[PDB]
Amino acid sequence: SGFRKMAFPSGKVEGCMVQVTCGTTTLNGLWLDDVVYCPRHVICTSEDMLNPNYEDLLIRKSNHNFLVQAGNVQLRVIGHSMQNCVLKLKVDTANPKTPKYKFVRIQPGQTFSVLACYNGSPSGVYQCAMRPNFTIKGSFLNGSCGSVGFNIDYDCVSFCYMHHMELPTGVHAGTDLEGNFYGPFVDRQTAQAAGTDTTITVNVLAWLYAAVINGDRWFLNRFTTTLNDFNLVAMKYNYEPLTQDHVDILGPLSAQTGIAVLDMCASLKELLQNGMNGRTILGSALLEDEFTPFDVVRQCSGVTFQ
Amino acid sequence: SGFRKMAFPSGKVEGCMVQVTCGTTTLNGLWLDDVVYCPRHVICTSEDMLNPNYEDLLIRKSNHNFLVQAGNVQLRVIGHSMQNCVLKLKVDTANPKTPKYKFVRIQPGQTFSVLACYNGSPSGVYQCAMRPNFTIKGSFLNGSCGSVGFNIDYDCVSFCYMHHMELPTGVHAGTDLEGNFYGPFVDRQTAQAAGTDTTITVNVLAWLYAAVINGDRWFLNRFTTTLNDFNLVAMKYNYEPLTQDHVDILGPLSAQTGIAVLDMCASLKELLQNGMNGRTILGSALLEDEFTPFDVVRQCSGVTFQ
Numbered sequence: 001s002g003f004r005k006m007a008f009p010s011g012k013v014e015g016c017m018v019q020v021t022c023g024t025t026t027l028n029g030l031w032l033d034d035v036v037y038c039p040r041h042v043i044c045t046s047e048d049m050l051n052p053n054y055e056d057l058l059i060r061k062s063n064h065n066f067l068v069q070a071g072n073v074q075l076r077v078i079g080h081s082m083q084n085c086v087l088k089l090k091v092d093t094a095n096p097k098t099p100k101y102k103f104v105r106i107q108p109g110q111t112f113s114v115l116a117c118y119n120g121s122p123s124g125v126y127q128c129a130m131r132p133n134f135t136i137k138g139s140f141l142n143g144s145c146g147s148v149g150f151n152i153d154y155d156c157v158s159f160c161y162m163h164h165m166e167l168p169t170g171v172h173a174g175t176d177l178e179g180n181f182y183g184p185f186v187d188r189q190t191a192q193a194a195g196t197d198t199t200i201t202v203n204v205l206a207w208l209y210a211a212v213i214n215g216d217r218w219f220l221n222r223f224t225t226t227l228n229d230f231n232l233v234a235m236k237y238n239y240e241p242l243t244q245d246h247v248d249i250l251g252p253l254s255a256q257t258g259i260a261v262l263d264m265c266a267s268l269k270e271l272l273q274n275g276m277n278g279r280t281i282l283g284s285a286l287l288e289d290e291f292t293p294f295d296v297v298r299q300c301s302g303v304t305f306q
Numbered sequence: 307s308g309f310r311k312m313a314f315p316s317g318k319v320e321g322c323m324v325q326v327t328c329g330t331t332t333l334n335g336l337w338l339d340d341v342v343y344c345p346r347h348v349i350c351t352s353e354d355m356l357n358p359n360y361e362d363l364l365i366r367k368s369n370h371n372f373l374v375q376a377g378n379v380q381l382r383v384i385g386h387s388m389q390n391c392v393l394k395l396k397v398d399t400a401n402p403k404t405p406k407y408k409f410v411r412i413q414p415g416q417t418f419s420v421l422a423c424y425n426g427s428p429s430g431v432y433q434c435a436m437r438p439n440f441t442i443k444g445s446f447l448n449g450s451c452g453s454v455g456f457n458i459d460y461d462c463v464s465f466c467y468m469h470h471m472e473l474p475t476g477v478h479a480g481t482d483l484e485g486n487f488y489g490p491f492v493d494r495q496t497a498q499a500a501g502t503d504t505t506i507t508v509n510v511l512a513w514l515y516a517a518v519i520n521g522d523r524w525f526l527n528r529f530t531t532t533l534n535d536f537n538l539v540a541m542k543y544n545y546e547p548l549t550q551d552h553v554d555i556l557g558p559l560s561a562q563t564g565i566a567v568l569d570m571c572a573s574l575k576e577l578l579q580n581g582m583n584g585r586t587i588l589g590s591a592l593l594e595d596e597f598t599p600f601d602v603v604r605q606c607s608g609v610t611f612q
């Protein structure tokens with residue numbers, strides 16, 4: 001038993017990380033087949049970033065201005081183009097470590113693993129959630145741009161996030177691998193509002209089911225509630241409204257534990273109204289919302305990949 | 307900025323995981339050079355585990371009774387031996403993915419990454435700490451035995467933990483890679499006491515320094531204290547006594563932030579005496595003790611590996 005915030009094994013993604021240099025700026029790229037993907041602001045000076053005209057800046061660049069370095073293997077750039085907020089550098093060599101992969105645009109509330117990288121070398125791996133306001137709460141320093149977020153289905157890596165920027169909150173924003181930002185953000189050094197965040201209700205419930213599976217059951221109360229009744233408590237505490245789609249998603253956990261979803265909702269409602277009274281659930285004194293129902297099920301059934 | 311519980315990239319360790327079968331029992335092994343390492347209780351039936359005579363049980367086994375499977379590559383076993391609580395199976399093939407490695411016995415309070423595995427295939431990676439009572443708080447199901455904990459120094463993997471068992475607490479116990487248990491535990495299905503745990507004071511302070519680096523500074527109070535004065539508050543709250551060795555270890559963080567260690571201790575003392583009053587630090591409502599001073603420094607300086 002036990003329950004931990006667990007990332008996917010990162011080996012398949014490690015083999016794809018490269019270093020991309022244009023001028024003095026160096027960031028990370030993702031090398032898949034014969035294309036390297038990276039944030040387009042690799043082409044900016046520090047001053048350009050205040051208000052860059054990326055088309056005009058890219059026109060001043062040629063293939064040989066982009067230095068792509070894979071460990072010490074170094075790649076010849078034979079084409080470049082800008083797709084939304086990413087650059088695609090065509091190289092003369094296919095990555096021999098390219099895994100089976102897919103580019104996906106994830107939904108708010110979903111989770112993914114991040115492989116944090118600097119100069120094209122991995123530093124660490126951690127799990128998180130795409131917030132409802134399309135930010136993530138990461139750990140990113142200068143030079144981390146181009147680090148990617150991903151999920152694994154057995155042998156297939158689904159890339160879903162590339163890091164671009166940090167917002168005036170210490171939160172982080174980025175794009176999918178077609179270069180479209182999650183949320184309203186633009187890749188410019190100018191003040192930008194994230195907007196109000198909300199707690200991912202279906203993930204909290206999943207985590208309460210995780211708790212029961214692992215023996216933590218003090219919060220299991222006696223009451224029940226209705227969707228409406230719970231959704232009224234939800235808006236007060238800035239939780240996403242629960243839908244029947246969410247109830248259905250929680251079906252397997254409901255069946256494994258014998259606790260109806262609406263009964264679990266009544267427990268959650270009491271936790272929101274009365275707090276935890278200095279107790280903990282799964283080692284936490286806060287209600288956790290960065291485990292999806294799928295995350296809980298894989299961790300309590302032992303799903304593997306390779 | 308930002309601060310996350312970050313594991314090491316697991317790729318170098320993924321390449322070493324194999325499946326070991328003896329009879330009906332299947333668990334994970336670690337394949338390094340031409341030796342596979344795994345828990346010796348792979349040789350037990352469910353009934354043997356109540357009180358196994360491992361020498362007598364191993365004598366009934368021959369090389370061909372051990373099935374070692376690496377993905378679908380499958381290895382010929384040409385020798386076996388028992389070292390403390392691990393078996394060493396000699397195979398006829400050196401692992402072509404063997405990283406530069408070392409076997410280390412870590413100290414209580416140190417951290418390491420765990421690659422959780424089933425049937426020799428990785429499922430997830432997460433960070434944790436060797437508790438002062440020589441347990442870990444992991445996420446482990448049936449078949450996870452043989453999963454390993456490790457740290458990376460650039461290109462060198464230091465293996466420090468192999469998983470063996472779960473205790474009547476939901477906590478976990480295991481051995482170093484020479485097969486010596488951390489703590490008083492034995493590999494038998496019989497009730498076993500872990501003993502009182504304590505909080506890793508130097509790690510809490512490191513995490514408070516992390517908080518200040520990332521802007522969370524509300525807890526920075528006005529007072530100071532002495533080691534003695536703080537250590538008296540320490541024993542009351544079941545914290546490890548702080549030593550001058552710990553103060554010295556915290557030197558770099560003290561210099562980076564301009565906060566004397568004893569000033570930070572006075573903040574910690576007030577947090578222990580008065581709680582957090584419903585506030586949070588680095589997104590947590592509890593005092594966190596599973597980041598070492600080194601963990602904080604690598605995460606706020608961007609150290610990489612490969």
Ligand SMILES: *[C@H](O)[C@@H](C[C@@H]1CCNC1=O)NC(=O)[C@H](CC(C)C)NC(=O)[C@@H](NC(=O)OCc1ccccc1)C(C)C
Binds near residue numbers: 165166191
């Ligand atoms: C790539 O290096 C990446 C790393 C940053 C540095 C620290 N944490 C990170 O994630 N970020 C960048 O260099 C960005 C380049 C832009 C997208 C051209 N810039 C930023 O992330 C900057 N943030 C920003 O401009 O967002 C809006 C804003 C907020 C507050 C004040 C002014 C603007 C940050 C370095 C501040």
Ligand SMILES: *[C@H](O)[C@@H](C[C@@H]1CCNC1=O)NC(=O)[C@H](CC(C)C)NC(=O)[C@@H](NC(=O)OCc1ccccc1)C(C)C
Binds near residue numbers: 355
């Ligand atoms: C290897 O499969 C490993 C996985 C376990 C299963 C669930 N979580 C885990 O980490 N554990 C084992 O099968 C152990 C084999 C022994 C070491 C021969 N057994 C255990 O971990 C058992 N625990 C145990 O015997 O510890 C002492 C004890 C505690 C409470 C009651 C009785 C004894 C557990 C499966 C209970």
